[model samples]
Target chain A: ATPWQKITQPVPGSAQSIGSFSNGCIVGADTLPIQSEHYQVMRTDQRRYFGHPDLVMFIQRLSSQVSNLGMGTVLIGDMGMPAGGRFNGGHASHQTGLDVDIFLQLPKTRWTSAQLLRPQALDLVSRDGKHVVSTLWKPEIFSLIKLAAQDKDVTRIFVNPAIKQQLCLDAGTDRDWLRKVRPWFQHRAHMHVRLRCPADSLECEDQPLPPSGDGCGAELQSWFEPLPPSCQALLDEHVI
Target chain B: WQKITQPVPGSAQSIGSFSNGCIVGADTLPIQSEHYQVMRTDQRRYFGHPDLVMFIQRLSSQVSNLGMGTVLIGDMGMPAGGRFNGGHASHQTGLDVDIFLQLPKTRWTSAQLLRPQALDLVSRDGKHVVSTLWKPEIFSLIKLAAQDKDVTRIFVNPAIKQQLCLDAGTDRDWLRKVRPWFQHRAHMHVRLRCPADSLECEDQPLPPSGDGCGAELQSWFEPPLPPSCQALLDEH
Candidate 1:
């Protein structure tokens, strides 16, 4: 095994969310407290809790918002490592501390401070990846997602196309927030929130804003194609 | 002696500076709200201008929506807005209030709140934060408070300001409103702008230009709050 370059401590000073996510790194990062009144950082052993302070704020605030709405505990998943860069062995898109994964399987009971959090995938997609899980789908998931999409800090929320369809079906007239929920494969268990280039990180890059409208209709069909459609191709090329 | 519960009669108005002003026709926060409680009820210091009251209520209600837990409100002002007896000189304008930094993940027992101890988050050396005591939510708490449009400024300990200066990514503009003061290690003192057209209300000049991250904050840690601050209250 070629030894992976381990980045132990964040580059000291304030957060500098520099460069593209493909090769970017953060400086002076902060950690989401491993446990709190609202959530438990699962897979602590992996130590992927570090992110730009804005990322931490977004997750903490979203989890608390989820809690306040009486939704159960939000199971958090991988964030970037301290001083964000590649895991060398993991996915390539989470650099710079702007992205986080929130699991869909919520625990109605608030997490006690003493316990270590664990993760399980409450898949929203089918075994054939054809449709959303019918019995498992509920309003809680919809609201949890709507809450994130509503936050101005959040730019896009990546979810399974089937789940996106469910959100579209349940969403009434106020569909503005729906523009941020972009559909992709492999997100059946968790939704990923991507924040805009933080206002502090002058060097941070901003992804182009999603086009106008609720992002429904024929374009969404593109994600289901066996071959990489125009939208999905970019992920394979850049988000490996 | 002014009765703590006796509010001055008139339309809601604030007069003079935060440290030296007073208020007329102030409003009272409910002894308990959906997400917060007055930590010390006996002091009867839960009065403020309607704007200040709304700020607290809105912020607390939003806090509950975030699932952040119960916020503990400390001294606001007496019914007639003036200095407290314990050499505390601020809160005279009814525009100021203290929010205890300790946020209970859940509401406390009525007995426990009889006067919950001020949970200290600053290190004894007075130079840094006690990492164990700092919660991500506390950052969110203060951010929400500063984001309030009616707020003029928020006084936090120097260490807290430094930490915020570091923690605030790409959004340092709000930092201008969170200034460094003394003895606020356990709470943040929020001061509201004077009501529009209240010629008698003397608002402090806007905070210094920069986010006050460099030497401005460092100087506070070097020395600290004068006689006027939200020194410990609710002990009664």
Candidate 2:
């Protein structure tokens, strides 16, 4: 088997996106630094923190904004492996360097080196996964999702359905940005933010934009349904 | 200015000669590990090619098992390879690393770890080991590095090689990879083969055959850089 983790550097050249996120490769990916003023990259031992420069800058901007608002440090999770292939961590779309996982729980205290290496990003959802837990849920999270959705380059933001339910109810006056805030399963700990292909990367492939609307009502409920026939093949291939 | 330092996002490749090359998609070595801690974070020289990073981790993990506390790593190269402000002519290709010969007895604060003046392994006259400070662990560390299949050569001061020649036993095979060069008293530079994935990656010529403990050793003692190397220094 090809040792994917052994590859620490991106393939040299201009950064190019060669295929779809789930089945593609990236050349010349940029690295997100281990430490930033408002964010910390978890699991620095692994080389999965790389991303497109645009993606990195977007997070940087969002991080700075969160800090300006006086929210505690934003703990970042896996993005993609160095070369952007099938990672052992089971992320299908992060293979393109456009997807990122930003944890919702804020740091209660300053992080030490040991904590950064083995960070357990807090789960915001309750045990039943029906709603965001009381003490853990902060208004800054909604601000973060809004900040990510407001970025022109961002394509989608995936969050747990319970969190989305609160956002839908809380969104008072303007809810246009809610179109990009999607609900996906198993996102209680963190939200996944994906960016659109940059204008310069003509070789890059983009998934069709999400259906336009507030995505509340039946559309949000549909995510609870069992694996559809179309995705069953992917599950079968990876079953072990 | 930051954009210039940003790698041209794409397939990783080495574009020019090692002395004058630029690399895109450089991989960064983690700052801290159970086995090692990257020193001199202020220098921001922790990045390298993926193959080079893996080799260091593999070597450091083995050394940790040997009870060497933590390997204090030195500069490798910048994220986008180019003429670094620091004095280096060859780290541009992301295939080179400078590892300290001295092992830490205890955890060091970030300030103390800042590239300490490398300890001189040889005596003042540069003829033999400083017996009190010299330990057999140095030989074991160098041997472990040479054993890696991906490594091209390990450069050290000529005096250290001479000490190894006197101490090394009948199995002298590892000495071939320990090539003696100019001022390398404190740390050894490990260079690896150009990774298999990069077609444009240039390969350094293999060192001449033999254990390199005899007459060939004398050439390194004669001072002055070779003309070609002089030209590279002049150009920089």
Candidate 3:
């Protein structure tokens, strides 16, 4: 059998999610709108913007809120293959139509064709990776993060440690949403949001819930550890 | 599995024969072009071999320069080529394309373009051209396509070929490429030879020599039927 990554279009059938994100398949997924009121998908020609209907709704609602709040347009990145399966690139978990990457860079002007072809998502963290950069970190970024975290369906939001620390400092006692936002590596320019499995999807494999805390303490340090033995099997099977 | 609908993710190639073939790594022709708009958008029948795509783009740009406005492109083939559901039998290979004879004066929206009826160039009795719509631009467009080095042959209704025979002057060498076929009343089918890169691509036999204006043209109007034709008709 050919690797699932080779198939460019969704496998034709009723929508269903089977197996874990790293080793699973999605059938009959919906494509996200290439251009919406508050977001324009970058690298559109790749046609990788498909997701489960729930994930699509989450993005549409989040983007509409961003527009309603008068924040600048969001640049959406790759979500998953049309048939959510293992991808050729390093993405390991976007396979279940529950994950999406939202860029921190807001379009200052209407996107030109060239920009759409080759998007330059702005880096929110500094070069040294110690903190969120001054000029690049706008109040709108925090608001966007808060809006994503507040979504009832959102399970986790991954960001660089610096951005999470910044949010921790800013949110103060209003830290409930911060629990859903976890610190990962190299998410300096974007945040990856994953949704909880819909109640109706009986076959959907649910990720174990994050630990019961704000996730602002020593647990964040564990993300820096090398690939756990469980994940090494995935790497041994493919070059990525 | 689903590979039949998914384009092979690299360079385009046609495998097998036209009537029984498949395309690998085919490139999709966009629904909208600067000089043409693809009709039947819902069919998603725009993918083609790269050579075919290049030829259509070149022809559309040339036709636009002739003041014909946007050419309404018809079915090409599916991405991973195979037997289509309707309106075609030989487009199984990505080498064949159907270009509408009628050119609309204005750009059409996707909704309006879906299954828009192409104007018939033939007369009510299907024996001659409707003089008003059969302008010199139609002749020029056909000639331009005929002259392309990659194009093997073009199929049109017998009446259209007869009319072209009457109007075309001594510089009639291009007429050899315009072959008469059945049921092409509203569009012309352009067939290209196999691209140089594909070793497995089977080529159709070359068209007969000469301008195709003599006895062969007369035969198309009243061709003899096969011996099984009567039995088939009676069975139906």
Candidate 4:
């Protein structure tokens, strides 16, 4: 275990994100309140609720904003850990406090601490890894992502290509925000939101801009190529 | 700690993200798969997720079919699948693997296998492949790999990508997956997409759209995380 993963609290000084998103660290990180009425951090034991003040403020405010807009509560997934370096058995990107994963399966009702301790993630990607589950797909999910991306601070919202495709098909008029909602793999359950480097955090790294346009065309189609036969064999192999 | 960690037995999944990740129930690439043999077996770095082993087995079989001969499998990851901290910081997770670019006509002899000398495929300036060392077969082998649906990235030296840009002609869609990285001349490092087993496994961001042969590739001609997060790891 690296020290960054073990440290219970952030280094007590000026807040700075001192590296690239994948290979960076953050100091003076702030911990979001674990269970606010509007939003809550899942996996409380992971100690991954820490981030820069801007990140803390964005989540705190955005959750309230979404709630006021009547989109239900936001389930905050892993942000960086207390000191914000390589996460303990988690991700390479959230090493900087500028990124967070907010689940797409929003709920208005609150749950007990015991239930959220190791909550089962709701799947939007089907077992076949093709389209979204017809029943689980909701219009509100689109609105939730749009709200996050419209914010000046948010630079990217990574979701499944299927999700992005559905968004394109649904977004008729104002589609500019779709540019920020980029598509990648395995984010069928949650959207990873990465923010631009904060104004005050001098050392926070800057993520490049997502290519222009809605990114709803050929780029999205490429992600859906069928899985390889050999890969499927390995996936189907029963591991001991 | 991951340094001396053991595979979490019967663990079928790669837990967590690639770089900050680990594997459970990790599988070893068979001591010798069809046309590929594990090099530096004593290092015991041939182990990886079953998906990786299967990839090598399938790809190696194609090597013989393609008449490229046996492939020398380089380090995949540690048996336990945490940080191997050598050529790069990755392979901490099991999906990243390396195969020697030197495609021998037959399996290496015991002495040759023990003392492996990789080809220097890149030019000294790093702008072009050393024409003498760069063989046409090398291009086709990497192309075959980049075409694999499971493969996400083919990190080769810049010159390899450039040479292929000229040689690939119009069948260039697969070129987008071939990325230019430092010192990947001898062995093109291949990374696979997260398999279905590892629900928690994280995928790196997708590469930029279009074949990366333009100004974007030129950016690498330019020169090349925070300290405290590491510093905390030092004393605490």
Candidate 5:
């Protein structure tokens, strides 16, 4: 066992200090506290989905959008599932409550079981009668994925190398704005998007009431102060 | 008060009652030669000590189990290093913790506080924002935590006591039970039991403790004994 080592005293706004997302227990989730019906209306009307209410709404919206885009049965994973497998370990499924994964649309010629299983092959897809796949790992899939992440609601986007390089290339032209959207590797074939927490929801605890900037910005700084009981209670209940 | 927007079935806020609890296996547990380190919340953050991290993790695990579903609210803990020039110190000694209030899933979108609704808090505009805690369960959770061998002391906001009593179904009896174990006002402060074989010594004796092992615990509920002038006498 590693002996406990005390470093510098706790200080907020620094990398050494723990943040809200730092600690939580991982437990099994059987029934989600929030329901899908309550979320559908929020998504269709484009109203803000606050906390679990809004989370369900966002999922419904994604389902509808996937259908409208005419994509084959898209698979959504990790929303309410037990958190494990390199996402973030916890009783809660996801780290900040606003993330989802959607698979890419592929053509029948390239949709063989072998191709789908080829991890890298899944990155190449033919969209709009044109092949604009990048040479990066999953060039084809990533190209279209970059487009989806372009949505305002989409915050962080992740993919394989081919898509990442393309995104980095796209960001190169407008480095300042593109920097707002961060990219990482999910390993899985599908892509993921996280929404910024809306102000006013209890689930948005410890989050800045108004989004500070492209990132946690000023709000992240103020988290050092003592939090209210309400906020603490929320953190305690949500194992995620 | 925030309200639960999409409360789970059977999810409800119930406060806990204060009670003198049990302490089993205390002798077998590890005991330190000194108190646990007393770094401030700010210092705790800077150090990121493993012991502090483990303490918080243990508490988080306990709370998660009690909450039944996931979703626990969190807050930064005490201003231990005393107030800084900028603001109150946070995350100082790694012992301080923060917990946010519980909100239902439906309300995650709006990000605003809600007024009371059926088994939840509501906004002034009549929208449900978040749900209050289930007091009885919360009390039980606290009660069980107090029994842990590693726990030294616990503190909470003074306001929670009354609600806890109502939830536990015994007003005076509950108060009597928790008095010895309780320290009130401000945030919830939990001092863990000193580690076994600790070398550092601040010369302070262990604080008064409650018998958590389900014995007749009324006497343990009294206010701590006042410090005497024994140090001066020891000098002679």
Candidate 6:
């Protein structure tokens, strides 16, 4: 029951953005700010009573509930450092923030962003002059994740376009709230879910902010254009 | 989504009050689990349960973002001791978990304790009752853990206290809580007592290690997917 604080300004939503929604989103840097002996003691007791294993259990429950079209295995990767990512390797290296990445560990099949928007995969329905994509999974697995997501404690769920499609499909009966989720493409590798930070630590301001008008449009469009002759030659050879 | 899975045994099947399939009543419930409805990134695949899957997701997320070390999940539980280990059952009854010494820095260096004086107790493995305690890595991992709410007691082999202190830095005060009761040893052992309704296992104390041949001990510390193994991929 820790209280999380609101951020005063908007922070980047994810490494990948589509220039939709309120520019960007807010994320808390820290949840528990004060470093007191008692807080540490509480942590000790909590760990003693329930350590990472317990956290694992909670997560496992979610995973089991989330299991449906894919087999899930926890990927042991790295969290770079504070203010890390493409610029600085990344922060998945450090264990301070306790951030987690959840993805569909698909069978040995190569996945691409384009494949995610297939007709069966994405059933887009129109509402109020806007198009929103709905998603659905096979029967059982969907039950697991959708139920877990319904839990009162779950604060946020970051999903790939596929999962978003399934959710939209599942909630087909009601399109009002479903439209607000604002689906975006994830790394194709995994989705991420973060727990709400304890209230007193440092407030995680979950706010919407104006977008940073960088030259990202040109950067994005350029990737879709044809490459140079040498690069095209490399593509033919299946080389970078 | 609520279709019958494996058949459940009647009460007559078990000596205890718990029935085989209806143990948690999940199967009998009218409400279907959402896991049954979702699809994978890959086509033509669906999972009946997502608990274990999400567990992996959460574990990886924390591991990747936090920098925690390897986690032994499948064969990570207690060794096959007598009838319990050989597949009559698996530690992964979808609930158990094991964490190694490595942890993400954010979860560790940035964590605060419930009490200021609690540092020494925690670092010392003092006021807690864990099954085992091991090297400083285990301690450091536990130190970061002292900040999480869902965590229970940590177990480690009892042999590695001084080393844990040296690595704990000024956060030694928390050791007081960790010293007396936490278990320390070769590999950090963790048990997760999640809600039973969530397809979690009931609290089952770990059975003693089958007589440890020196080799078994050595093997326990060995990484599952060793770095050298990756070289095999480079082969034609």
DockQ of candidates 1 onward, in order? Answer: 0.01, 0.00, 0.00, 0.01, 0.01, 0.01
Q: DockQ score for model 5, please? A: 0.01
TM-score of chain A of each: 0.87, 0.88, 0.87, 0.90, 0.44, 0.37
> Chain B TM per candidate, please?
0.89, 0.87, 0.89, 0.88, 0.40, 0.35
Off by over 4 Å in 2: A1-3, A224-240, B1-236
For model 1, how does the per-residue alpha-carbon lDDT over A97-126 read when each residue is reduced to its tens digit? 888888887787654434434555667787
**Candidate 5 runs further than 4 Å off:** A1-51, A81-93, A105-147, A168-180, A185-188, A202-240, B1-236
Candidate 3 residue spans exceeding 4 A from truth = A1-3, A221-240, B1-236
lDDT against the true structure, each candidate: 0.75, 0.73, 0.75, 0.75, 0.32, 0.29
**B1-236 in candidate 6: lDDT tens per residue?**
02223322221110111111112111111112211111111211111122323443454444444444532222222111111223323232222333434332333221221111111222232321122322233444566543233333344443233233323332333433232123333234333334434422334443333212122222322212222212222321
- Cα lDDT tens digits, model 2, A15-106, are 76556677665667888987688898888787789877777888799889888988888888888776576677566677667889888867
Q: Candidate 6: misplaced stretches above 4 Å?
A: A1-58, A64-87, A90-98, A106-148, A172-182, A208-240, B1-236
Error of 4 at B82 (Å): 74
- Worst ten-residue run, lDDT, model 2 chain A? A225-234
Tens digits of lDDT, candidate 5, B32-117: 11111112222222222234345555654565555432222232222111122343333322233333223232322222222212
- Writing each residue's lDDT as its tens digit, candidate 4 over B29-141 gives 88855688778776667777889988888888887678877788888887656655565577856888888898888678766766688888876766556645666678778
Tens digits of per-residue lDDT for model 3 on B1-236? Answer: 11355565656777666666767678888766788888886777788799988999999889987788768788888876666665677776688899998766688877778968878887765554565567667877788889899999999998788666644544567788999988888899998898899856779887898778655765665522222222322333
Ranking by TM-score: 1, 4, 2, 3, 5, 6
Off by over 4 Å in 4: A226-240, B1-236
Candidate 2 residue lDDT tens string, B138-206: 877888898799898999988777656534444566778889987788899988888888766678797
The TM-score between candidate 1 and the true structure equals 0.48
True contacts kept of each: 0.00, 0.00, 0.00, 0.00, 0.00, 0.00
Better of 1 and 5 by lDDT: 1
Comparison by TM-score, 1 against 2, better one: 1
